[model samples]
Target: QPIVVKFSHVVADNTPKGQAAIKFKELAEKYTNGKVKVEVYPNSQLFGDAKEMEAVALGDVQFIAPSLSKFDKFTKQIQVFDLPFLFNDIAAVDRFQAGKQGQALLRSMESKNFLGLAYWHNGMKQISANRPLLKPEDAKGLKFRIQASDILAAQFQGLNATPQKLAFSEVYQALQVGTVDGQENTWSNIFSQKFYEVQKDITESDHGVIDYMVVVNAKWWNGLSKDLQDAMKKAMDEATKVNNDVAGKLNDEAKQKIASSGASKIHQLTPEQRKQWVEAMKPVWAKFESAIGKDLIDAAVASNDTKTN
Candidate 1:
């Protein structure tokens, strides 16, 4: 009998995550020879990020590709990825996470009822707002939409910006209606949603890197036959490589496209300006270190052989 897997995410059909889902579906079905059928639910058709995660926990959904920051609720160790300026760029991220250190982190998630299949990059986050945000002070007092994560909320608070926690799909409308003055997301997503049409600036802060995990419910995953399990793992690893490579390329293309759209001005911060922005986020790390615990944070930082500023 064939096993069916339901995959869910909160982006449009053309975005990196959505396109990756299509690839995963094709590859899994082809490789498994009809033994594994993957069904994709993009744009929150099944559930929003938080609820989708809950569904997976309840075995209602077979799999989820939530932004890594969302995993903080289940395993605080994952919150280390949320630290500002931790990853210098895509190369640094691949070296630290896709290598040995990332595998160790995946192993740790098993204790939290999740089997981390692979780490896929979503590129670094940039800010989109009604007006260009040139410095940390420019961002102050503006309402920004953030993911439904307390750690993210705290980060905005540390920056002295008002955070409006909303579903990903609601962002465009939020910006249009003036419910939010700005939001942060990758370049591909900003273009995918055409948020630039409503917003006027793209601040290249690279404040955070977006990572995703193909996670399965531990109970369901462990009960699978050895052969089936191995097949699934192999498929996931292949998909991870494809997903990361495509994300980087697509993000660059999206930036160029958005620039030509003439809807938003792209602001590239100077090195000194970027440094000041990074320094401003220092309090966010201090505040969450205790809430997320010190040991897990220490282990993650040590795993990268890097220290938080």
Candidate 2:
């Protein structure tokens, strides 16, 4: 009998994550020659964002790549990923992923029985709202939806905004009903979710990076035959390259899509305006240093400057 790997996530079928899942499915099936069947369920078809990992953990699903913030339940170390303003841009992120620090952090879930395979880049997050978010002071008292992470909640508090944790599927409705005045997400997510329809102002804050990790149920992985294991590994390796390569350009095109739609206005801070945000959120990073590791945080700052400049 052929083994099955069930994969799922909470985004559209054409998104980067969706495409990567489809690519992996094609390769895994091709390489395994029907000995291993990979089934992908996107747009929360099988499980919502909050429930997918639980499915994986219970062995109901074999493979999942939920947002990195979702792993905060397993260990606080994953909070390092949510630290505000860590990377200069996506270039620093690419360097960090290929470096030793990224590998060490990826393995942070090992104790929880999930085998980490890759970390994916979704692009930096921009804050969208009904009003301009040009300065830190502007966000005071505004409610923002966030992925369920303490570090992310702290990031909003540093700006004096209230953070309301919600699943990805709930955000658009929350914004539509005014439950949240603003939210942060990649351009692709905001556009694809039609958040632009509800929120007209977007600030290219990129205050934090959004990422996910691909992990398999460790028991299923460990039990696989050597030949099958190698085949799965090769498939994942190639799929990650496709995911990362398409991410930035995909986001760029998405940003243009939103801009051309006339449903939203995008703005970037002036250097002076940006300084206000950096200064306000710098304390949030400092607050998490001990919990997330001081050396890792500092190195990200230094490397981002070096690699991005």
Candidate 3:
């Protein structure tokens, strides 16, 4: 019998996650001598991130990669990956993902009927607007598009901005019509989805990390023969490496593409400005400490510290 896998995600086809999915499909079918067929869907064409993993768990979809933060509704332990500014740099993220803590994070979701294969990076997320958003206070009263997460909602609330929870499919129309002043997303997303066309300024805040956890329905995963399981594992490992390798490079390329077009201005934070922004958002950690559990927070910090310092 032929094995088929339906992979879905909420991103443009050119985004790292999308490309990685395509790459995996290509290699998977080739390696298995066409015994396995992977159908890749991007840009919420199959389902929005809100329902992506739920669909996968139900076996309506075989694979999906919702952001790590999306899992907060089920368990807060994974919020460790969503904490803003904790990694400092990509090197810090590299250490933690390759460590014991990372494996524990992957195991956190098995109870939900999915297995976490890897964390695919989308690089640092940046905010964009028609006006310069240089200071934390500048965002006051401005409407900003955000994914559905309490932590992100609180981050905007701290800036006195309205967090306009939105589906990724609706964001382009929303931005074009001025439904929201700006939104936060990776550079690749901005470029691939042409979000820059609707905005005048892009702020390279590097405020936090953006990542997706590749997940497969546990029932589907366990149904595979041991050899097939090992093959899929090796294929995912290679695809993840590509995802990580191109994430930052593509972000830089996207920034240049946007700059060359003169469609939008890209802004970087000076050290002082970043410090001010960090100070303003510091309340976010304390705000969610109790809800997400302080243990995970401490472990995240320790994980980065051990690797970086």
> Largest TM-score belongs to which candidate?
2
The positional error of residue 141 in candidate 1, measured at the CA in angstroms, is: 1.0
Clashing pairs in 3: none
lDDT of 1: 0.81
Per-residue lDDT of candidate 3, residues 1-309 (tens digit): 788888988887777898899888888887777888889888888889678877986888887888776777777777766667777776677677777877778878678777888889887788888899888988899999988778888889888999988888889899999989899988888988889999999998988777888888887898888877877777888889889878888888988898899999988889888899999988889877887678767766766554343
TM-score result, candidate 1: 0.91
TM-score of each model, paired residue for residue: 0.91, 0.96, 0.94
Task: For model 2, name the residue pairs that clash.
Answer: none
- Score each candidate by Cα lDDT: 0.81, 0.85, 0.83
Over the stretch 4-50, how does candidate 1's per-residue lDDT look in tens digits?
Answer: 78988888877677877888788778777889999999888988865
Highest lDDT against the true fold, candidate: 2
Candidate 1, residue 272: how far the Cα is off, in Å: 2.0
Model 2 lDDT per residue over 101-186, tens place: 87887777777788888987688899989999898888999999999888889889878899999989889999999999999999
Which regions of candidate 1 fall more than 4 Å away from where they truly are? 99-101, 291-309
Which structure is stronger by lDDT: 1 or 2? Answer: 2
Candidate 1 at residue 31, lDDT?
Answer: 73
